[PDB]
Amino acid sequence: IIDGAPCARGSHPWQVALLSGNQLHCGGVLVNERWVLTAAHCKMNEYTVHLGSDTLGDRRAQRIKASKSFRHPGYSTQTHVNDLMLVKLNSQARLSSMVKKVRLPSRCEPPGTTCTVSGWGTTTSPDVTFPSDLMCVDVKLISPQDCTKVYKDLLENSMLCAGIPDSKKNACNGDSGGPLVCRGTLQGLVSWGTFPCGQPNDPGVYTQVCKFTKWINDTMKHH
């Protein structure tokens, strides 16, 4: 997260981290005891799942191994259309005051609503610096018609843009697949943005979770 703040203790119990080796690779959200909920470009092979949390990474806990994961059938790579993936956990996650399910949206939050994106990505750009503490920033939803003026072609109706005027002031490397989170309610997963991350009037994008809920719970089951 760029131009953010250390997120407030235990206010993100749905937030997870996907690790490889022991390096942070992606963020994610816990939909239930057996599933995350990340971006598709975070595939892997597998996955060590961290929750919860705030700091990577103490004790107490909990690490859980993944092994199985399913990418949305329409995911590109050239474009980042339908950039979401589900990750089946090897064992169940034990819900606590530090570990909870996200509330999936019913409704697509309109442009202009204040939101919160969070993660363990670099806090500077292009210059890498990885925080141990979960990081947090506030951000407004931006209408397709406004966002489109920046990113013409690249946008699809299932992508969502978020940012502030003026900036500067959104997600960055390693935050991919992380939550955003508007009055509720998970509206998106961080998908892509600019490099270097975050100046003034090019938004982040997001994966409108809002438009995949059908696929999401269909895709569980699986088993």
Swiss-Prot record:
What Pfam families would the database entry show? Trypsin (PF00089)
Task: Write down the glycosylated positions.
Answer: 217
Membrane as a keyword of this entry, yes or no, is no
Tissue-by-tissue expression: Abundantly expressed in the skin and is expressed by keratinocytes in the epidermis. Also expressed in the brain, mammary gland, cerebellum, spinal cord and kidney. Lower levels in salivary glands, uterus, thymus, thyroid, placenta, trachea and testis. Up-regulated in ovarian carcinoma, especially late-stage serous carcinoma, compared with normal ovaries and benign adenomas (at protein level).
In this chain the Peptidase S1 domain maps to 1-221
Q: In this chain's numbering, which residues are marked as the site (Major binding site for inhibitory zinc or copper)?
A: 80
Question: What induces this protein's gene, according to its Swiss-Prot or TrEMBL record?
Answer: By estrogens and glucocorticoids in a breast carcinoma cell line.
Entry keyword set: Disulfide bond, Glycoprotein, Hydrolase, Protease, Secreted, Serine protease, Signal, Zymogen
- Activity regulation per the record? Inhibited by Zn2+ and Cu2+ at low micromolar concentrations. Inhibited by SERPINA12.
Annotated family: Belongs to the peptidase S1 family. Kallikrein subfamily.
User: Per its record, how is this protein called by name?
Assistant: Kallikrein-7
Originating species: Homo sapiens (Human)
Q: Which gene encodes it?
A: KLK7
